[PDB]
Write a protein that binds this ligand. Structure first.
Ligand SMILES: NC(=O)c1ccc[n+]([C@@H]2O[C@H](COP(=O)([O-])OP(=O)(O)OC[C@H]3O[C@@H](n4cnc5c(N)ncnc54)[C@H](OP(=O)(O)O)[C@@H]3O)[C@@H](O)[C@H]2O)c1
Length: 286
């Protein structure tokens, strides 16, 4: 263990988010002091307020889960917002963290910022080796710049700042809106509206609580400079996924290379059928 969170002050940026809330849940078990700021009180694109919040509270650990995220329609129609919001968040937090000597910082990348035509399964060193996917290039460029700024701080100063590269997430606080772009929520939705109405390629899905566990694992064990993929491992086809979904509801080429996180002795512990059923019932009861 290169680093222990016990006794440390941990700022979880974006704690109302899907990923941020999972981190906060995993943390309240830990013996630490957790620090949060709602989006309503601290706009993390504002360099002034962000620095004063970091200089006043002085966290040992910053976990950056604050972000502007959305589907293909949002990214192509609001590219300036998707670039600026995410870049300014990362720049303001990384710079403030470097200035006061924050012991550990975690930035969140994304599986969709690798080159569009990079070889599958995606290794972390595929980053920047080719053209970006145009529809979310603005988001990708912001996430890439933040990752590289964290890397430059680790190189120049030895700041222990790392980036995790997740994959498609599901689980608690997912987006079940009818306009959600998340495949699995919409499938549970489309198959449920088909179940009670009585009508006639490979993918990867990672449970948010596994991702949260892996993030704390990287914080406790990972000191490298390069990013680390956090993948599912257990793949499934949209075909096989539909039959898994339909059996849940009673109806009648984008995968990460996880060699690196596996060498750290971490592997996701939630099975797809367990998480889906556990999420199918919460969507009913809510
Ligand atoms: N494919 C992948 O690898 C993948 C998939 C999902 C997530 N991720 C990673 O995880 C990150 C978060 O994803 P999510 O799904 O958790 O996004 P989310 O659910 O939309 O969470 C967004 C969070 O950021 C907060 N926020 C937004 N703008 C802010 C600002 N200006 N100042 C302060 N807080 C602000 C939101 O606050 P309010 O909403 O309360 O304002 C919310 O707390 C993504 O950016 C990405 O790096 C990766």
């Amino acid at each position: 263990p290169v680093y222990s969170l016990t006794g440390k002050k941990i700022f979880v940026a974006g704690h109302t988010g899907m990923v941020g809330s999972a981190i906060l849940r995993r943390l309240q078990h830990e013996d630490c002091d957790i620090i949060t700021a709602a989006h309503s009180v601290l706009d993390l694109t504002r360099q002034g307020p962000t620095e004063n919040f970091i200089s006043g509270h002085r966290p040992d650990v910053i976990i950056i889960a604050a972000a502007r995220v959305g589907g293909i329609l949002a990214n192509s129609r609001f590219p300036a917002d998707f670039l600026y919001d995410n870049l300014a968040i990362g720049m303001n937090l990384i710079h403030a963290a470097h200035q006061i000597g924050v012991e550990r910082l975690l930035w969140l990348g994304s599986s969709c910022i690798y080159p569009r035509d990079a070889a599958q399964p995606l290794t972390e060193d595929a980053l920047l080796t080719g053209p970006l996917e145009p529809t979310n290039e603005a988001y990708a460029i912001a996430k890439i710049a933040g990752l590289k700024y964290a890397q430059s701080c680790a190189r120049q100063f030895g700041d222990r700042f790392i980036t995790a590269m997740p994959t498609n997430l599901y689980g608690p606080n997912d987006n079940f809106d009818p306009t959600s772009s998340h495949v699995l929520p919409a499938l549970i939705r489309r198959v449920h509206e088909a179940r009670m109405r009585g009508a006639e390629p490979l993918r990867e899905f990672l449970h948010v609580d596994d991702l949260a566990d892996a993030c704390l694992h990287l914080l406790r064990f990972y000191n490298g400079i390069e990013p680390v993929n956090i993948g599912s491992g257990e793949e499934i086809s949209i075909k096989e996924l539909a039959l898994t979904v339909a059996r849940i509801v009673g109806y009648e080429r984008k995968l990460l290379d996880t060699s690196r996180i596996e060498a750290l002795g971490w592997q996701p512990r939630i099975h797809l059928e367990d998480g889906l059923r556990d999420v199918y019932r919460n969507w009913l009861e809510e």
